[PDB]
Amino acid sequence: SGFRKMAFPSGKVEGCMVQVTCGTTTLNGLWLDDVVYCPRHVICTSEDMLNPNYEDLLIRKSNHNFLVQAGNVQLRVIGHSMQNCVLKLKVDTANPKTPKYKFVRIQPGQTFSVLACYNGSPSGVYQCAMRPNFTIKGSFLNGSCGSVGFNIDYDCVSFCYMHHMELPTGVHAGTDLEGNFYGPFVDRQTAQAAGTDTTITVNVLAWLYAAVINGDRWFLNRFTTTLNDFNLVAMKYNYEPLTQDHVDILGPLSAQTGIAVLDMCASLKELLQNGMNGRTILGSALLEDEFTPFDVVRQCSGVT
Amino acid sequence: SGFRKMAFPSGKVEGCMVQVTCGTTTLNGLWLDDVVYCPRHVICTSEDMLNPNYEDLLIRKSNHNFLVQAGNVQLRVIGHSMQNCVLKLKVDTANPKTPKYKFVRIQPGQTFSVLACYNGSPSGVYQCAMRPNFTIKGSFLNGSCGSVGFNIDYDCVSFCYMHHMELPTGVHAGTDLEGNFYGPFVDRQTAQAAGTDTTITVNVLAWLYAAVINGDRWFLNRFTTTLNDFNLVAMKYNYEPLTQDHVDILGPLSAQTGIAVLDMCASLKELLQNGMNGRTILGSALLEDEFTPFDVVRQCSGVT
Numbered sequence: 001s002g003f004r005k006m007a008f009p010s011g012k013v014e015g016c017m018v019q020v021t022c023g024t025t026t027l028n029g030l031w032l033d034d035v036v037y038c039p040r041h042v043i044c045t046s047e048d049m050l051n052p053n054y055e056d057l058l059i060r061k062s063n064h065n066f067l068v069q070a071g072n073v074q075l076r077v078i079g080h081s082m083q084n085c086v087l088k089l090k091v092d093t094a095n096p097k098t099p100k101y102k103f104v105r106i107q108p109g110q111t112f113s114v115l116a117c118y119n120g121s122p123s124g125v126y127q128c129a130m131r132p133n134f135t136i137k138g139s140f141l142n143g144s145c146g147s148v149g150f151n152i153d154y155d156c157v158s159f160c161y162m163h164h165m166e167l168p169t170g171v172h173a174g175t176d177l178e179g180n181f182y183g184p185f186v187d188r189q190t191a192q193a194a195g196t197d198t199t200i201t202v203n204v205l206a207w208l209y210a211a212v213i214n215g216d217r218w219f220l221n222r223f224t225t226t227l228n229d230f231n232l233v234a235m236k237y238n239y240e241p242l243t244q245d246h247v248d249i250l251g252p253l254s255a256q257t258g259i260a261v262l263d264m265c266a267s268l269k270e271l272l273q274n275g276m277n278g279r280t281i282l283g284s285a286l287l288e289d290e291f292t293p294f295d296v297v298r299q300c301s302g303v304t
Numbered sequence: 305s306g307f308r309k310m311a312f313p314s315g316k317v318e319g320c321m322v323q324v325t326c327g328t329t330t331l332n333g334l335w336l337d338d339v340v341y342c343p344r345h346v347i348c349t350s351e352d353m354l355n356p357n358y359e360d361l362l363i364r365k366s367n368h369n370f371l372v373q374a375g376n377v378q379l380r381v382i383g384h385s386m387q388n389c390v391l392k393l394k395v396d397t398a399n400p401k402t403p404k405y406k407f408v409r410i411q412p413g414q415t416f417s418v419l420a421c422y423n424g425s426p427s428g429v430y431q432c433a434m435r436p437n438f439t440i441k442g443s444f445l446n447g448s449c450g451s452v453g454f455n456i457d458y459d460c461v462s463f464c465y466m467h468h469m470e471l472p473t474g475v476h477a478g479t480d481l482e483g484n485f486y487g488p489f490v491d492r493q494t495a496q497a498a499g500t501d502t503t504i505t506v507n508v509l510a511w512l513y514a515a516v517i518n519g520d521r522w523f524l525n526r527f528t529t530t531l532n533d534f535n536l537v538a539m540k541y542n543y544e545p546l547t548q549d550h551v552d553i554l555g556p557l558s559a560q561t562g563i564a565v566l567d568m569c570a571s572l573k574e575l576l577q578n579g580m581n582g583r584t585i586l587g588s589a590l591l592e593d594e595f596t597p598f599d600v601v602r603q604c605s606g607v608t
């Protein structure tokens with residue numbers, strides 16, 4: 001029993017982290033097979049970051065300008081290319097610790113683990129969601145750029161995020177491993193406001209299911225609702241609209257607890273309209289939205 | 305910027321997890337050098353768990369009865385001994401992935417990471433505190449026994465916890481790696497109630513410091529207090545008493561933010577007496593107590 005915000009075991013990713021230095025700028029890179037991936041702004045001075053033309057800056061950079069250190073050992077750079085907002089540095093040595101991996105672009109609402117790194121060395125691991133405004137709420141200090149987000153299916157690491165940026169509001173923006181920003185963000189020291197950080201409704205519902213399973217029952221009410229009625233309340237409370245695709249995904253949690261999805265929606269509706277009245281659910285005083293239905297099934301079944 | 309509940313990178317510990325089977329019971333063991341550590345109740349049937357005499361049960365167990373599997377490879381058991389509530393199985397092969405390690409008995413209020421494991425395979429990592437009643441609030445299903453809690457100082461893993469038990473209230477009890485239970489708990493299927501789960505005051509204060517650093521300011525008030533006045537309010541709210549040792553430990557956070565510890569105490573006092581009024585601090589609607597002062601310094605400075 002018990003339900004915790006849980007990250008993937010990070011070992012497989014720890015084995016991929018390197019330090020990348022280009023001039024005076026040091027950040028992290030991801031070493032998979034014989035390629036190091038890092039944010040392209042490794043080539044920039046803080047002065048370059050105002051209006052950087054990256055192709056122009058990269059003309060002044062050769063293979064030997066990129067310093068790649070894995071542990072306390074230098075890697076030989078034998079090729080470099082820009083892909084979107086990432087540099088792919090080819091090195092003359094395959095990472096002997098390359099796990100099975102995929103690059104995946106996630107959707108808003110999807111959760112992933114972050115291995116926070118400084119100088120190619122892991123400091124910590126935490127669980128995040130891609131927010132509906134394509135920001136993440138991370139923990140990232142200077143030097144943390146190139147720290148990655150990932151999911152693991154048994155032995156295959158799916159890399160979904162690389163850290164590039166803090167917005168002036170202190171939320172985080174980054175790319176997939178093809179170097180494509182989540183959301184409208186660009187890697188420039190310029191005005192970039194996030195949109196509405198709405199609540200991930202399907203995730204709240206999953207976590208209410210996790211609560212019931214784990215014995216937190218008090219919020220269960222006498223009501224049901226419809227998707228249309230629930231969505232009117234969702235809109236008012238800056239909750240993402242619930243679709244039948246979300247209902248479908250919650251099916252296994254519904255089946256276990258014998259609580260129909262629409263009934264759990266009616267209990268969420270009452271929680272939105274009446275608040276917690278100083279009560280807690282799985283040790284939270286607010287409705288948690290960084291557990292997917294898949295996360296809840298995984299944790300409550302014990303997949304490894 | 306940003307402040308997250310962060311676990312230690314788990315790789316070094318993942319390299320130590322094995323499966324231990326004794327008869328029909330499978331749980332996890334920790335393989336350090338040429339010793340496997342596991343909960344002694346590996347020898348028990350659920351029928352044995354009612355009033356187990358462990359020395360008597362262990363007479364019916366030889367080296368070959370303990371099945372130790374590291375990955376998909378069997379280890380040869382060449383010796384076994386009971387230490388308190390743990391079995392130490394000597395194996396004929398040092399764990400080639402043994403990190404630098406210490407066994408440490410932590411105090412209530414101290415935080416640690418848990419690598420949740422099933423059949424010797426890691427499922428997840430999360431951050432816990434030893435509660436003042438010597439329980440932890442974990443995420444542990446059947447098969448998770450022998451999952452360990454740890455801190456890391458650079459390259460040295462300090463092992464502080466091994467998982468043994470769920471209490472009927474669904475909170476968790478276990479041992480240090482010398483097999484000594486935290487708190488009064490025993491490894492028996494019997495009546496065991498936890499005491500008062502008080503709030504770890506020094507940890508709340510640290511997290512209020514983390515909040516200020518990260519730009520959450522709204523709760524800062526116009527008041528100060530004394531340890532004696534604060535402690536009267538603490539008592540009423542089932543907060544641990546604050547000592548001058550706690551004040552001393554918060555010194556570095558006080559110095560950074562130029563907020564005297566007693567001033568932060570006065571702001572905590574007002575939060576206890578007036579509530580959050582529907583507001584949040586570092587995305588929490590309640591006062592978080594699972595960050596130590598050391599955790600806050602580590603995360604806010606970026607130790608690796």
Ligand SMILES: CS(=O)(=O)NCCc1ccccc1
Binds near residue numbers: 042
């Ligand atoms: C090259 S640096 O040392 O000055 N750091 C870059 C951080 C940054 C990334 C994207 C946009 C704004 C800033």
Ligand SMILES: CS(=O)(=O)NCCc1ccccc1
Binds near residue numbers: 345494
């Ligand atoms: C030996 S088992 O399969 O039945 N599981 C033991 C779990 C347990 C541990 C301590 C006290 C009560 C129960």
Ligand SMILES: [Cl-]
Binds near residue numbers: 026027142143146
């Ligand atoms: Cl950086």
Ligand SMILES: [Cl-]
Binds near residue numbers: 445
């Ligand atoms: Cl178990």
